[PDB]
Design a protein around this ligand. Structure first.
Ligand SMILES: [Cl-]
Length: 395
């Protein structure tokens, strides 16, 4: 039935677009850089708002303002196509972006880079990235992050030192902010990108933390990932600096420490205490509080709390909560099993697109009859709809 399958696809663009935003933000991209900043204002508001009517109203509103020399319309349009392709059968984003590059539009290369990042082909075009970004570097500060990424994957130490000096030189001249430097540093401290320059990442971070406090968290997180160049003494210092600056993520990582007890003696109620303070400021809090209640870590197991907090996180964009809610309903260990919910949530976790999620979704659909599967699939979409359709503060 290509009727619903083509409905499930449009709702899959929706969860995938949210994840792409979160990953671009984590990486350092500003809202301007990801296309979130008359027909111009409107067509842009709509594209990043939405129903398939708004996606199409957005396209046209943008496509027009474009022809009429309205800057800040190309990135917004490219994101629309890249984030909801199943809403645009008429378009082939890559060709569209290839046209704009040929035309000479300044923001084309950036659009082209957002392309490799959204579709997942980055590693195949490190050369094209390098080229696009060397040319836009003095006009698009996010390119410092992309070149540092390239020089990390291409394992090119020399080019990185030149880049870093260009970046420092720009700090001196006032053309580079502390957030860029922080982002570049986190690139240098990414064991995933190849051969990390952790110490350089540290030198960079320490200079900027006093005035860009999110760096205390980056520093703490940098020790966690390279445990061998700082003591619990430091860790706890960077974290204190973080707590003092009012950085909710400081509470988050601190509670994670007492949760895995690999840096300090595993302590159950302390972590809950710490994660609790990030609740409402960091979606992961709800997720880490959900695990504790699922694994019964506080000596005992609390089913309804675990679901409650795990669902909240899943409904707020947490890419791992649905997977967990699946495990909660299947592994027993305190929680009575429920095959249907297990399925529905392992299917929702599939949308996050991970082998782990695939591997779990096939095991949990195995127990269902063809009717239950169609029922559960009915629930999957009902639930995705609700998320799309969607506060209170303490003190
Ligand atoms: Cl990457």
């Amino acid at each position: 039935d290509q009727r619903l399958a083509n409905e499930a696809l449009k709702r899959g663009d929706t969860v995938t677009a949210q994840q792409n935003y979160q990953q671009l933000a984590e990486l350092g991209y500003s809202e301007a850089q990801v296309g979130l900043a008359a027909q111009a204002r409107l067509g842009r508001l709509l594209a990043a708002k939405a129903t398939e009517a708004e996606h199409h109203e957005a396209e046209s509103l943008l496509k027009k303002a474009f022809a009429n020399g309205e800057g800040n319309t190309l990135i917004p349009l490219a994101m629309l196509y890249l984030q909801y392709p199943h809403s645009f059968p008429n378009v082939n984003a890559q060709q569209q972006i290839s046209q704009w590059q040929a035309a000479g539009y300044p923001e084309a290369g950036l659009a082209q880079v957002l392309l490799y990042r959204t579709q997942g082909t980055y590693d195949q075009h490190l050369d094209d990235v390098e080229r696009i970004c060397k040319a836009a570097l003095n006009t698009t500060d996010i390119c410092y992050v992309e070149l540092a990424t390239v020089y990390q994957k291409k394992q090119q130490p020399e080019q990185q030192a030149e880049l870093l000096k260009q970046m420092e030189a720009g700090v001196s001249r006032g053309t580079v902010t502390a957030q860029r430097v922080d982002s570049v540093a986190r690139v240098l401290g990414d064991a995933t990108l190849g051969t990390p320059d952790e110490k350089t990442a540290q030198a960079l971070l320490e200079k900027i933390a006093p005035g860009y406090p999110a760096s205390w968290v980056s520093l703490a997180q940098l020790l966690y990932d390279f445990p061998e160049l700082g003591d619990v003494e430091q860790m706890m210092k960077y974290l204190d600096n973080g707590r003092a600056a009012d950085q909710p993520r400081a509470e988050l990582l601190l509670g994670k420490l007492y949760y895995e007890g690999k840096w300090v003696p595993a302590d159950a109620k302390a972590a809950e205490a710490h994660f609790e303070k990030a609740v409402g400021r960091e979606v992961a809090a709800d997720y880490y509080l959900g695990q504790i209640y699922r694994r019964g870590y506080l000596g005992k197991v609390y089913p309804q709390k675990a679901l409650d907090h795990l669902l909240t996180a899943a409904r707020n964009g947490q890419n791992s909560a649905d997977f967990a809610i699946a495990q909660l309903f299947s592994q027993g260990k305190g929680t009575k099993p429920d095959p249907l919910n297990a399925y529905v949530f392992s299917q929702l976790a599939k949308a996050q697109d991970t082998p782990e999620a695939n591997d779990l979704a096939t095991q949990l659909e195995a127990p269902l009859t063809p009717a239950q599967r169609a029922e559960g699939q009915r629930l999957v979409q009902q639930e995705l709809a609700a998320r799309g359709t969607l506060l209170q503060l303490h003190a």
